[PDB]
A = this chain, B = another copy of it.
Amino acid sequence: CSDIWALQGKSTETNPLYWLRAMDCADRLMPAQSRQQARQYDDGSWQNTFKQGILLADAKITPYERRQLVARIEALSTEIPAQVRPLYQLWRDGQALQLQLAEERQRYSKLQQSSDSELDTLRQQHHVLQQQLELTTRKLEN
């Protein structure tokens, strides 16, 4: 696994077995090691961007980091060798669905926040309205 990251060349890039190993090796790393290793692959070529994505995906990254990860991976989709596309696609779909999950959890968090604040606003208003009514009833008796 120590040797797989440095491999370059036409014969390596177009081999689905290479990228499968790379992804396998990344799963074996500790999240902190994945983040650190990904930093090496910032040249901007599709090969390094893909390698960076594979490593960065296994790190403890933020949802907005993954949003940016997904975007960079989608941008280079046309340069992915035809043989590798089905593997790339499967890995990308995995990153995409993790993003959707993060977005759904955010949606739920916004609904639970807004509903609670709206409910309690009404409950404070119910307290004022109830007392003001009973004060008014009292003043009518006087």
User: Is the Cβ of B125 less than 8 Å from the Cβ of A86?
Assistant: no
Q: Are B126 and A119 in contact (CB under 8 A)?
A: no
Q: How far is the CB of A101 from chain B (nearest CB, A)?
A: 6
Report the count of interface residues on A (CB-CB < 8 A).
Answer: 40
3 nearest A-B residue pairs (beta carbon): A97-B97, A115-B115, A24-B86
Closest beta carbon of chain B to A56's beta carbon, Å: 16
Q: Chain A: residues with CB nearer than 8 A to chain B?
A: 16-17, 20-21, 23-24, 27, 85-87, 89-91, 93-94, 97-98, 100-101, 104-105, 107-108, 111-112, 115, 118-119, 122-123, 125-126, 129-130, 132-133, 136-137, 139-140
* Complex CA distance for A90 and B92, rounded to whole angstroms: 10
Residue of B nearest to A91 (CB): B90
Q: Which residue of B lies closest to A105 (CB)?
A: B104
A94 contact from B94, B105, B130, B139, Cβ within 8 A: B94
Closest CB in chain B relative to A88 CB, distance in Å: 11
- Please state if B111 and A101 are interface contacts (CB–CB under 8 Å): no
- Asked whether, in the complex, the Cβ of A20 is within 8 Å of the Cβ of B87, the reply is yes
Contact A90 B94 (CB under 8 A): yes
Pick from B16, B85, B104, B118: contact of A101, CB below 8 A. B104
